[PDB]
Amino acid sequence: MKFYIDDLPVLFPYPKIYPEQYNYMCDIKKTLDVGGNSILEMPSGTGKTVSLLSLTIAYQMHYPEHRKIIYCSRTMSEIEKALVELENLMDYRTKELGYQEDFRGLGLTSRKNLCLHPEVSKERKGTVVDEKCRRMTNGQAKRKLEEDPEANVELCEYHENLYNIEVEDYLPKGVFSFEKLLKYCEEKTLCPYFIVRRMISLCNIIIYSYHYLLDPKIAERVSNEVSKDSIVIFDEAHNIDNVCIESLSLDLTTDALRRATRGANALDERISEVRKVDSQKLQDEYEKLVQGLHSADILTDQEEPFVETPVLPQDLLTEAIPGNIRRAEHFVSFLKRLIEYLKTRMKVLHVISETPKSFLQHLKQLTFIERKPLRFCSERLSLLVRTLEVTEVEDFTALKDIATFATLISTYEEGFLLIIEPYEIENAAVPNPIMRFTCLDASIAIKPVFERFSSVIITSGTISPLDMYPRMLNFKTVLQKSYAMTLAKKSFLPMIITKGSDQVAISSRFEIRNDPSIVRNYGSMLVEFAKITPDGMVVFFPSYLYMESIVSMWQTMGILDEVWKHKLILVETPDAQETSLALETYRKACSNGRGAILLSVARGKVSEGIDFDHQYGRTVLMIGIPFQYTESRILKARLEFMRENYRIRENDFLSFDAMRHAAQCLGRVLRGKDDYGVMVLADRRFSRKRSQLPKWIAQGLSDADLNLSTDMAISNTKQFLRTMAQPTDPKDQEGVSVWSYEDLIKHQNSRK
Amino acid sequence: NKDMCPICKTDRYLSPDVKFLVNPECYHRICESCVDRIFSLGPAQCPYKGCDKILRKNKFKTQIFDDVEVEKEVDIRKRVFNVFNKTIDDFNGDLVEYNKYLEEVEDIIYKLDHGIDVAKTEEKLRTYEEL
Amino acid sequence: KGNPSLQNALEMARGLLLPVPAHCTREVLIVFGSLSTTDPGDIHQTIDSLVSEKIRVKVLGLSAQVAICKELCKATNYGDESFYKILLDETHLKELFNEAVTP
Amino acid sequence: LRGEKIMQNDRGDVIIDRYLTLDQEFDRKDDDMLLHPVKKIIDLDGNIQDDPVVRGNRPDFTMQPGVDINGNSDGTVDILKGMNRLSEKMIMALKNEY
């Protein structure tokens, strides 16, 4: 429809609108008029994405400012879903307005998802795809082929064809989803990745992941091309802090250190060979470093550094090279002695938790390495690798981790902690040391996002509680509110199962995973739910190892044999490719009525981004609360950091994280108010955590369901499934759960 | 060998008394038992074949890095940095001249490490340490 | 006894309704009791063939709303989702059986 | 083939067990007609490859497959792939001319 919010005409691509969608648009428009950060818990099931897209495009085209739009999500699948919704929205806008306006919408992802070269396509790692695409498209290969046409080097035809046409002539106007962009670039023989990367400054709206805004290894180039006065939307941001922890962390193993020694020796051999052949290619770099030119001055815009910058651009030093690492052999010896100091530090028999300042002092007193040459380690390594013109970079991949560690631990000294553990896994007999430099303050990586952009709209389907995040991440919300969906009938029926069929209390604690009776209750529960579920069913587990153990011993006693009589079993493999096959097989098995059960981790890959709507959902079996491994040193260090700084209790934060993962997995089941699915929680500890649930979930959870047994839950599920199997009355839902245009006009007239 | 001390020919397994007693003069895998046997009487030459530099027992130490070349580079860096200790405040904030001084001290450390200009750089170090 | 096959029943009914003349309407009434079905082939091809033969299928389910039955009813009844009926109690089953005698 | 874990204490049958390695080859060949590109809506492979240079903290052993005392896998991940392969084969058997 078409309706007006204040002076803003909104083109909604559906003939009916939920009331929660209209209230959501009103709050977003109020925030954009204010121009500050806000947190909005738009409930799942309802059109969270489509309302955001419709209102922000209406705000962009109507207002004379024409602010650009950034849409940051957590998974590439959600990016594609947002692109599809945006394509539908602009198709509706073109139909209503009668013309296709000047519009550009593109999704941004890595080279692995946007490569059309037939040779480098089957590589299972994204790093080798990036290094091969760089090797073919660094510009050195192009000038080498221009100077030597008979050279054995090759160029990618999908990248060269972009040189013939202009940047604005890469694609026609409109929105290009990844499937459509790949089809178009295959038809025109073009590289979609370089098309998207060059159209960042031209796109009215650009959708990418949180890694392209928070992780400075890839967000350095993207954040320069975007406008600082742009609208910023965060979709499914309830786990965004983990991305911040994922942005500024690094783990080093002794195998990585051995490969680093081998790479340093290979680098020394290469610099010795180049010094014998041509020292001019070293002398020009040396005098450029003398003049104070940084990596950006020596590198061209088309090429990329060998080592990505692991720190924030605002934290990079603007002064020149200190000179200890200016000479190539001196820098090689510097890196070698840094690697040997790291190898010395790894030979420990107990866990050492030390600040970066203490590590720097010990390194200076043992190796005479200062902080200032360490702050330029990654830049100097990238410049040396560029000037060496090495054909092979696989031997120097381990040096990237050393440069990342050197640059990270030198620039950052507050909010970071270095953990050295003698045992990576306690089950292994031989000791396997690991050194973890982790980011305890998640607000560090997200601080330049809030500093650069005035208006940030944090939104997740199950972001709760809304006041935890502005304390966790240093930002102020102008308004925070959580909507409750208006339902003619109770659309979803949550229940908390604290005890089994034989009234034995059930829990998913890691130490009691091998108890008979709790596993008997879980197996009988799963069999009964598979017997009573019509279409499909998804089961979530706190960890992969817990699921492995419980499924293996379920197969040992033959619980799964009874499940095979009703539904097919598909399990989340650690391999993402086989997991995708299992997921599409689950979707196929739900469609044709075979029935399937999908076992997955509540904190795994399937838990984030993947939706289970209608027949793909219908039952979310929660085996326990997805708590993290408490005995891990990183989690305890982060908990101590939040207790020290933000006064957040350790148990409170652990319960918050576990219940937000449970909330997102429960919210994956709903799309539309016609959709239904039961939300069963099989742990005794869920009962005290009803207030930590999202507000819309908490309304559906009655007080009588807080301590249900197995059989009572089965009876309630059967009654619920029989209840909505009837057709609903339209007169009971004509203007209370869904609104037409006339109902929206009547409500607008009632509001004034 | 990384495990066995060829001077006494003792494996680490059945003879756990072997230790990483290195020499600043010439770094070698001599154990403490071989040190307490040969050099307790007095100074002598290097017990390893192919090397005969005169060494003292009291100069012995333990290696802190796995690589011998890195260990001798760090020890030469210590032997140069003791008198070469000019800082930023020593140059009164002159950043470029501080970089030139760092390049010079790294170059003389490299020359002492590889021995290409050991005599002239040693003379320069001996003249500098008197000042 | 056994695990029911919707596709086998639909193919048998398609074979039965093939010699039916064009003036005589072709209708199938499926009283489906189970919640999952095992088919020897693709049931969507059978649904498309039934749509191409103008055969209208009405399904009365016993336990819950099965998605494949809803899709089959919607495809065979030209988008009408009201032909998939689920009972509530004893008399509702009587009323649903008495509703199907009307053309 | 039943999904039970294989232990070396069982005698098996020497005539049948000659096919075991060949059966593994069949399992490999099973992937040879099971692996195919999927839509970007459910592309879980591209989700972890969206950030190619991510080097965050390694997940703990609860988030990883179980290992033996020597570090090798305990084989409980193979039965998961076995039942997933069985489900995929039963679904793919419906895709025929019938």
Ligand code: SF4
């Ligand atoms: S230029 Fe594009 S198509 Fe060619 S190798 Fe690189 S990513 Fe692949």
Ligand SMILES: [Zn+2]
């Ligand atoms: Zn000895």
Ligand SMILES: [Zn+2]
């Ligand atoms: Zn010697």
